[PDB]
Design a protein around this ligand. Structure first.
Ligand code: BEF
Ligand code: MG
Length: 929
């Protein structure tokens, strides 16, 4: 229960109810460090380098400089807090640019923003203005009191909802208390009561309410008192709590870093055991060796991953091909590269929700929107036989509807609960005969065109019904005084009752294969006496025999390039689904008209009290009871289509897809009918463009339409995943190659590998001499943006996990074994290892490592830009001018030797020839396309 008094301002303004401000940022100031630290320190490859850094606090485990094990931990902490702090402040900014929308308030007598709006203030909302919160209609501008709200984003419905004002309290201005029930998740149920003086309780229901992201129509203004605001709304109660999202590449890095830790621990144990278990502290040894080997990979991986993710977010949100795209969760820009299941919405996502009557067909000939002059010159002559047939068809289209128009200065606007009739009447006025004032309580319909103003009065009406699919009225002309029964409905209902025609079924099938919601038309000529014979009275008499004029083809307009987008995203192995809270037949028509269901390809259907097309109740009960079996059935169907689903079922479908198969789920949509599934997916994508953008406000990404998901998944995400995989490969290779060089020095000389790279050299390799060409790899792509359309098959080649697999990790480990062994052993052979040639050998080993990395970087570059050819040269020249001028004590040597340069050439050629020839043979046996 919730009782609201609009007059008692302070009792709700100060307290007692939730403020209208919404929150999209997750971390507040007081829990910014514990939540972020506890989220970042569950995974192994963060906790590992944290433990490595904390080890140096103990003086026994001191491997060397304290300015090499504490400063990169501080740097990763600074970068992480900066990234999530920027994300939180940007989320707060994005939320407040939509919290400041101005709304007229009756009691305040001054427009106040949406964030300042409270519960119980009389808001006067105009026609084209988005509803602030959960309003309740108490007064409407129309004398009848009906208002057609536009629930295109509260739920997925594509039809306007008939909302009448409260009949007892519309004529009232006075202050009246509102008592509604406590909030639930029921998006289609409303309960409450309106309280007036002298104990006159009134009933409330869904028919006199407006909800959060709804848009009003069918008026100029209406006096509505807010009842639910903030997180108590029916919109917010259907949104689940957002969870932290870690990419699957993060998990792959976690696993291969776990077994990298196992590998270096085994290498340390081997070195210590081969040493001879001397020095009386074998455990202190193995810990020191483990810290030595595992402090260059696990912390360089973090900086590279984090700043590469920042680079990916910047490069996503600064693309001219995808204008006005927003990255709201920068922790997962590479999950877009491995998406196999996509769960899309229909209204706003696929369809523009603006339907137009495309083709009119009558008498075995068809007229479309193109060549509309013929029907125009036919209708202007209203005041051979096909001319009168067309005239009567346009007359029927302008009479049989249930559109109730309203008047402005100009440019008349139509209002009807079934927008197909609105498309019909817009078509009629485009032909030339325009619908005008209609009573619908008394009997009058005005119409006029290029000629003289017509006039028709109805006699009685039959309302449209869901299970009937029929809409017909009896109308008499004022000028001609003729009784016409004028009646319309669906094809299947009338194919056996309209006439003895022959060409109807073929044309109905032909246009239904185009995804047009066809309506077959009918008209019956009557006189008076039979009418008052009918009026003396079930439905058998009112339907005896009609005359088939023709039928109407009403299309549901799709967004820009949904055909090509769906075809390309199904050519890339992504199993596109379609879950929507909208009706069933229009969902099927949209699916067929979007080529989501191709030619033939029979469609199955389930509705509880190849292809698929399932009702919301059926899917909900199945995923409540028969999870594994039904999901095993549906993974083989090319498309599964859901209808009439609360956001909970779409979120649960995403959860089940990512749980039973363990795969990544993308979910695109707009409005609050798909916020939960966006939050509960592995990737959430939002769409903007209309008066509500809350799904984009709660999403990981944001694009202006559906055509941009093709570039967001097939090109940006795939490149992001490939670049991150190559980055991790190169970082772990450099760490393992220095570890192998140290271990080979340990086996060839019993002192210690810690003594090999001491002081500046190890810090320089860990941070300065190698950080730049990895990010040179970060800015490289194999295929351009223009060719992400012609080759959607490149997206399929990443589904196995060959980029970061155990086999390729062990290939990297074996390659590091080979290359580091070559470097160290050839350095020892060319330097004649002693205690006096130590400087020369460590010099040649470090130079061999550096040039080895700088050549391996140039080997795995697909296309060469000027941000990559320059970075390599900059780092190489930095090393060249940093050997003498900075160190001057370590690794010193003559270095101007012909023998030394030949030795360096040999030790580098032997290291870089296996990888070059392996990629050459892999290119010449598996060419790319
Ligand atoms: F878009 Be789903 F129906 F939540
Ligand atoms: Mg929607």
């Amino acid at each position: 229960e919730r009782e609201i008094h609009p007059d008692t301002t302070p009792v709700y303004d100060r307290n007692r109810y939730v403020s209208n401000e919404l929150s999209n940022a997750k971390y507040n100031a007081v829990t910014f460090v514990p939540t972020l630290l506890y989220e970042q320190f569950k995974f192994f490859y963060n906790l590992y380098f944290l433990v490595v850094a904390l080890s140096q606090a103990v003086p026994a485990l001191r491997i060397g400089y304290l300015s090499s094990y504490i400063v990169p931990l501080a740097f990763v902490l600074t970068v992480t807090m900066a990234k999530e702090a920027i994300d939180d402040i940007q989320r707060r900014r994005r939320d407040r640019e939509s919290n400041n929308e101005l709304y007229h308030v009756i009691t305040r007598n001054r427009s106040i923003p949406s964030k300042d709006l409270k519960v119980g203030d009389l808001i006067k909302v105009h026609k084209g203005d988005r509803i602030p919160a959960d309003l309740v209609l108490l007064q409407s501008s129309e004398p009848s009191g009906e208002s057609f709200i536009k629930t295109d984003q509260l739920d997925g419905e594509t039809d306007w909802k008939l909302r009448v004002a409260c009949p007892l309290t519309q004529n009232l201005i006075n202050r009246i208390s509102i008592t509604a029930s406590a909030p639930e998740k029921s998006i289609h149920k409303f309960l409450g009561k309106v309280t007036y003086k002298d104990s006159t309780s009134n009933p409330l229901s869904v028919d006199n309410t407006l909800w959060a992201n709804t848009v009003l129509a069918s008026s100029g203004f209406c006096i509505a008192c807010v009842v639910y605001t903030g997180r108590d709304t029916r919109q917010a109660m259907n949104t689940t709590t957002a969870k932290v999202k870690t990419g699957l590449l993060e998990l792959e890095i976690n696993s291969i870093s776990k077994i990298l830790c196992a590998c270096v621990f085994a290498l340390s144990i081997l070195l210590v055991a081969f040493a001879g278990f001397h020095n009386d502290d074998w455990y202190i040894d193995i810990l020191r060796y483990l810290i030595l080997f595992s402090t260059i990979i696990p912390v360089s991986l973090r900086v590279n991953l984090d700043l590469a993710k920042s680079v990916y977010a910047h490069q996503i949100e600064h693309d001219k091909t995808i204008p006005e795209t927003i990255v709201r969760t920068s922790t997962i820009p590479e999950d877009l590269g491995r998406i196999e299941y996509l769960l899309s919405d229909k209204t706003g996502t696929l369809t523009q929700n603006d339907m137009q009557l495309k083709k009119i067909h009558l008498g075995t000939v068809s007229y479309t929107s193109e060549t509309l002059d013929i029907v125009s010159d036919y209708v202007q002559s209203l005041v051979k036989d096909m001319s009168f047939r067309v005239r009567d068809m346009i007359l029927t289209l302008a009479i049989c509807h249930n559109v109730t128009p309203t008047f402005e200065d100009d440019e008349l606007t139509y209002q009807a609960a079934s927008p197909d009739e609105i498309a019909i009447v817009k078509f009629t006025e485009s032909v030339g005969l325009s619908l005008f004032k209609r009573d619908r309580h008394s009997i009058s319909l005005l119409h006029e065109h290029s000629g003289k103003t017509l006039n028709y009065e109805i006699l009685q009406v039959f309302p449209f019904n869901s299970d009937s699919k029929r809409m017909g009225i009896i109308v008499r002309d004022e000028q001609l005084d003729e009784y016409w029964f004028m009646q319309k409905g669906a094809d299947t209902v009338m194919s056996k009752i309209v006439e003895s025609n022959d060409w109807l079924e073929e044309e109905t099938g032909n246009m239904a294969r185009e995804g047009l919601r066809t309506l077959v038309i009918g008209r019956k000529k009557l006189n008076k006496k039979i009418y008052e014979q009918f009026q003396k009275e079930i439905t058998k008499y009112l339907e005896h025999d009609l005359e088939l004029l023709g039928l109407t083809g009403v299309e549901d307009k799709l967004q820009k390039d949904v055909k090509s987008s769906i075809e390309l995203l199904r050519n890339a192995g992504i199993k596109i689904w379609m879950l929507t809270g909208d009706k069933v037949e229009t969902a099927r028509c949209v699916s067929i008209s979007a080529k989501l269901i191709s030619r033939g390809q029979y469609v199955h259907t389930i509705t509880k009290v190849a292809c698929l097309l399932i009702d919301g109740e059926s899917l909900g009960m199945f995923l409540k009871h028969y999870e594994q079996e039904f999901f095993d059935v549906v993974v083989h169907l090319p498309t599964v289509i859901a209808c009439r689903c609360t956001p909970q079922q779409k979120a649960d479908v995403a959860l089940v897809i990512r749980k039973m198969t363990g795969k990544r789920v993308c979910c695109i949509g707009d409005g609050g009918n798909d916020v939960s599934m966006i939050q509960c997916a592995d990737v959430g994508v939002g769409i903007v463009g209309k008066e509500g953008k809350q799904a984009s406000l709660a999403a990981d990404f944001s694009i202006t339409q559906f055509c941009h998901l093709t570039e967001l998944l097939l090109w940006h995400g795939r490149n992001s995943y490939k670049r991150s995989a190559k980055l991790a490969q190169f970082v772990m290779h450099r760490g393992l190659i220095i570890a192998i060089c140290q271990a080979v020095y340990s086996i060839c000389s019993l002192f210690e590998p810690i003594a090999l790279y001491q002081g500046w050299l190890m810090v320089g390799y860990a941070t300065c001499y190698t950080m730049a060409p990895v990010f040179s790899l970060t800015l490289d792509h194999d295929i351009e943006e223009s060719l992400t359309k012609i080759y959607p098959e490149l997206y399929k080649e990443l589904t196995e996990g060959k980029s970061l697999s155990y086999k390729t990790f062990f290939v990297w480990v074996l390659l590091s074994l080979f290359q580091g062994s070559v470097i160290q052993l050839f350095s020892q052979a060319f330097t004649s290892l002693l205690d006096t040639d130590f400087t020369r050998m460590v010099a040649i080993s470090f130079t061999a490592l550096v040039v080895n990395e700088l050549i391996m970087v140039a080997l795995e570059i697909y296309t060469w830009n000027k941000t990559m050819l320059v970075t390599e040269i900059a780092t190489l020249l930095f090393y060249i001018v940093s050997v003498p001028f900075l160190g001057d004590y370590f690794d010193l040597g003559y270095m101007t030797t012909v023998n030394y340069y030949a030795g360096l050439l040999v030790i580098l050629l032997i290291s870089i020839f296996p990888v070059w020839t392996a990629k050459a043979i892999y290119r010449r046996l598996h060419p790319p396309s």
